[PDB]
Amino acid sequence: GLWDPTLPMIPSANIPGDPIAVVNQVLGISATSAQVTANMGRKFLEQLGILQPTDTGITNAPAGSAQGRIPRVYGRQASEYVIRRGMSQIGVPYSWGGGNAAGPSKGIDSGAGTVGFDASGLVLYSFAGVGIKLPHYSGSQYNLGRKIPSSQMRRGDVIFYGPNGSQHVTIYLGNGQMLEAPDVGLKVRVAPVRTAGMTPYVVRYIEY
Numbered sequence: 001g002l003w004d005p006t007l008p009m010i011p012s013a014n015i016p017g018d019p020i021a022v023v024n025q026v027l028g029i030s031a032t033s034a035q036v037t038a039n040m041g042r043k044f045l046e047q048l049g050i051l052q053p054t055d056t057g058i059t060n061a062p063a064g065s066a067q068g069r070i071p072r073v074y075g076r077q078a079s080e081y082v083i084r085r086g087m088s089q090i091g092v093p094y095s096w097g098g099g100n101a102a103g104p105s106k107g108i109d110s111g112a113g114t115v116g117f118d119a120s121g122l123v124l125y126s127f128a129g130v131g132i133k134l135p136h137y138s139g140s141q142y143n144l145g146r147k148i149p150s151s152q153m154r155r156g157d158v159i160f161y162g163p164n165g166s167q168h169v170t171i172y173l174g175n176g177q178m179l180e181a182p183d184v185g186l187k188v189r190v191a192p193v194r195t196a197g198m199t200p201y202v203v204r205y206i207e208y
Contacts, residue, residue, distance in 0.1 A: 041131020
């Protein structure tokens with residue numbers, strides 16, 4: 001069928017725009033995922049010794065382009081940092097709609113009372129570390145980056161499920177394993193890759 005039958009066979013949470021990611025009610029500040037992501041991207045480019053005054057910190061390639069802000073020679077480093085971030089969230093609860101560029105967060109609808117990640121939330125949190133800004137909806141993530149045939153998926157690529165990649169999204173780890181925020185009552189986990197419902201392409205956000 002069109003869907004991974006192990007998960008709800010509906011589109012994933014679709015959270016619009018640029019959500020507030022950090023709130024500090026004692027200091028009286030707040031900032032959005034795009035703000036947190038830009039800050040992290042500038043930090044990453046500075047640690048590579050390549051920050052420029054024109055850099056906002058957002059490092060995405062134009063969708064479909066093989067050329068992004070992060071040089072190819074540094075792409076493996078960037079990818080491993082993204083994976084490190086994601087893997088550091090192993091054991092955090094799933095929450096439908098949960099997560100932002102700063103970490104897990106309260107979800108929506110069903111996940112309104114649970115601080116955690118959903119699938120696209122975990123992916124956007126992970127990639128935000130190197131300035132790769134992603135929308136909080138798997139289907140919209142699928143339209144960014146560069147498509148790679150799923151048969152040629154590589155560690156750091158992003159695997160999608162459902163029509164238009166609308167159901168679920170995970171980070172491929174290589175060796176037939178993926179990092180995911182799977183479903184209600186579970187935790188961020190490493191799991192075997194599932195092919196049911198998988199889109200015919202994975203997405204690459206970082207070239208190397």
